Amino acid sequence: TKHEISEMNRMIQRLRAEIDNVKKQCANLQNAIADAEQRGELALKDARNKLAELEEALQKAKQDMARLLREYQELMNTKLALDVEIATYRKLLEG
Amino acid sequence: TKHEISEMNRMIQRLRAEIDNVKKQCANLQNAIADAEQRGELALKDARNKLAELEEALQKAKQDMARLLREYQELMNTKLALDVEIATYRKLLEG
Amino acid sequence: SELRRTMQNLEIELQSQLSMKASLENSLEETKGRYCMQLAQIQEMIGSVEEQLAQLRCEMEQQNQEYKILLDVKTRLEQEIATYRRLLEG
Amino acid sequence: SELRRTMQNLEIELQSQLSMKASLENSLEETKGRYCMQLAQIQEMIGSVEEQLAQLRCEMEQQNQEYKILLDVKTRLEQEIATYRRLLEG
């Protein structure tokens, strides 16, 4: 056992060596994770803004298209209004 | 129990109704999954090509830079070659 | 034996750590994909809206052109009426 | 009872299905993130190489300019030598 000992002492050395190592690794993973969360939470905040930016833009467009279509109908009206005057001004010139 | 029955018969109806429903859902998830795999496997193939395309391009550049640096040194040489001739052609003109 | 005991206890402690580490690794992968997906999803929404918006903007352009067409007719008619209202008293 | 029995068996069968479905849902999420990440990774490699390549191409340009500078000197020297080799016998 005088030798068995030397091998156990060397194992203990190997063992704490790695235990202490894994502890470092864990600590790093721990960071890794916090960074990913921070990094990701941000990217989402970014995206969620661009979205609301668009969302607003789209509502504005929707309204302008509303108005455009209304402006067209008014024009169409007053146009036909003249279609009349013309037809009547014609008859008056074929007498 | 003449009533308990009607309630059990209606439960059985509700039960098969949903069992058969979940079965549809499962079948769809099943598809969902196959599509994702097919779709993804492809996107990776795409990327893995662009990569190898670049990889090749980069090696080509690396070689041209190799050649460029060599071409420079040859020029630098023949340049100093003239630095001599000039210095010597000078002395000959200060006599 | 008392030596063998503390060596074995260390063998065990290494295992704890080793486990704790493994689940920590998987937890990290989990986190990473999670955000990856969540992001992908919003990216897609934005795509849809961008194109929804674009599609609309294109249609507003088409509208404006149509209005122009109509308007050109309208003003022209005004100049017919003008020459009619001319020939009558002239 | 024989009725109650078949109703309960169905209650159980629903549970099976319900479970099988749940794990199928999670399996799908797993798949999706997996590819999402794997893709993200390669995307990044490509980024690195693109920029590695770009950086290089920029440096090749700088080199070419430097060569031009040197070359202009070289040809000029040739024209000094030419006027020296001129004044001597002239």
Curated annotation (Swiss-Prot), chains A, B:
Variant or mutagenesis effect after changing N31A: No effect on interaction with KRT14 or keratin intermediate filament networks
Reported impact of K62N: In EBS2C; uncertain significance
Query: Tissue range of expression?
Result: Expressed in corneal epithelium (at protein level). Expressed in keratinocytes (at protein level).
UniProt feature coiled coil, ranges: none
What does the PTM comment state? Phosphorylated by CDK1, AURKB and Rho-kinase, phosphorylation is regulated by the cell cycle. O-glycosylated.
Impact after mutating Q30A: No effect on interaction with KRT14 or keratin intermediate filament networks
Per the UniProt entry, the effect of Q59A is:
No effect on interaction with KRT14 or keratin intermediate filament networks
Localization per record? Cytoplasm
Q: What is the effect of changing E18A?
A: Increase in keratin-positive aggregates and keratin intermediate filament networks that are very thin and sparse with short filaments
**In this UniProt entry, which residues are annotated as the site Stutter?**
Q38
Q: Where is this region: Coil 2?
A: 1-95
Note the subunit structure: Heterodimer of a type I and a type II keratin. Heterodimer with type I keratin KRT25 leading to the formation of keratin intermediate filament (KIF) network. Forms a heterodimer (via 2B domains) with KRT14 (via 2B domains). Interacts with PLEC isoform 1C, when in a heterodimer with KRT14. Interacts with TCHP. Interacts with EPPK1. Interacts with AMELX. Interacts with PKP1 (via N-terminus) and PKP2.
Tell me which disease this protein is linked to.
Answer: Epidermolysis bullosa simplex 2A, generalized severe: A form of epidermolysis bullosa simplex, a group of skin fragility disorders characterized by skin blistering due to cleavage within the basal layer of keratinocytes, and erosions caused by minor mechanical trauma. There is a broad spectrum of clinical severity ranging from minor blistering on the feet, to subtypes with extracutaneous involvement and a lethal outcome. Epidermolysis bullosa simplex 2B, generalized intermediate: A form of epidermolysis bullosa simplex, a group of skin fragility disorders characterized by skin blistering due to cleavage within the basal layer of keratinocytes, and erosions caused by minor mechanical trauma. There is a broad spectrum of clinical severity ranging from minor blistering on the feet, to subtypes with extracutaneous involvement and a lethal outcome. EBS2B is an autosomal dominant form characterized by generalized blistering manifesting at birth.
Its annotated function is as follows: Required for the formation of keratin intermediate filaments in the basal epidermis and maintenance of the skin barrier in response to mechanical stress. Regulates the recruitment of Langerhans cells to the epidermis, potentially by modulation of the abundance of macrophage chemotactic cytokines, macrophage inflammatory cytokines and CTNND1 localization in keratinocytes.
What's the further remark here? There are two types of cytoskeletal and microfibrillar keratin: I (acidic; 40-55 kDa) and II (neutral to basic; 56-70 kDa).
Q: What species was this sequence derived from?
A: Homo sapiens (Human)
From Swiss-Prot, chains C, D:
Site (Stutter): residue numbering on this chain: G33
Q: Where is this region: Coil 2?
A: 1-90
Q: What is the effect of changing A82T?
A: In EBS1B and EBS1C; uncertain significance
**Post-translational events:** A disulfide bond is formed between rather than within filaments and promotes the formation of a keratin filament cage around the nucleus.
Q: What is the effect of changing I81F?
A: In EBS1C; uncertain significance
Instruction: Give the location in the cell.
Output: Cytoplasm; Nucleus
Query: Hey, what tissues is this thing expressed in?
Result: Expressed in the corneal epithelium (at protein level). Detected in the basal layer, lowered within the more apically located layers specifically in the stratum spinosum, stratum granulosum but is not detected in stratum corneum. Strongly expressed in the outer root sheath of anagen follicles but not in the germinative matrix, inner root sheath or hair. Found in keratinocytes surrounding the club hair during telogen.
Disease implicated? Epidermolysis bullosa simplex 1A, generalized severe: A form of epidermolysis bullosa simplex, a group of skin fragility disorders characterized by skin blistering due to cleavage within the basal layer of keratinocytes, and erosions caused by minor mechanical trauma. There is a broad spectrum of clinical severity ranging from minor blistering on the feet, to subtypes with extracutaneous involvement and a lethal outcome. EBS1A is an autosomal dominant form characterized by generalized intraepidermal skin blistering that begins and is very prominent at birth. Epidermolysis bullosa simplex 1C, localized: A form of epidermolysis bullosa simplex, a group of skin fragility disorders characterized by skin blistering due to cleavage within the basal layer of keratinocytes, and erosions caused by minor mechanical trauma. There is a broad spectrum of clinical severity ranging from minor blistering on the feet, to subtypes with extracutaneous involvement and a lethal outcome. EBS1C is an autosomal dominant form with intraepidermal blistering mainly restricted to hands and feet beginning in infancy. Nails may be thick and dystrophic.
Assembly state and interactors? Heterotetramer of two type I and two type II keratins. Forms a disulfide-linked heterodimer (via 2B domains) with KRT5 (via 2B domains). Forms a heterodimer with KRT1; the interaction is more abundant in the absence of KRT5. Interacts with PLEC isoform 1C, when in a heterodimer with KRT5. Interacts with TRADD and with keratin filaments. Associates with other type I keratins. Interacts with EPPK1. Interacts with KLHL24. Interacts with PKP1 (via N-terminus) and PKP2.
**Protein task:** The nonhelical tail domain is involved in promoting KRT5-KRT14 filaments to self-organize into large bundles and enhances the mechanical properties involved in resilience of keratin intermediate filaments in vitro.
Q: Which residues of the full protein are shown?
A: 332 to 421 of 472
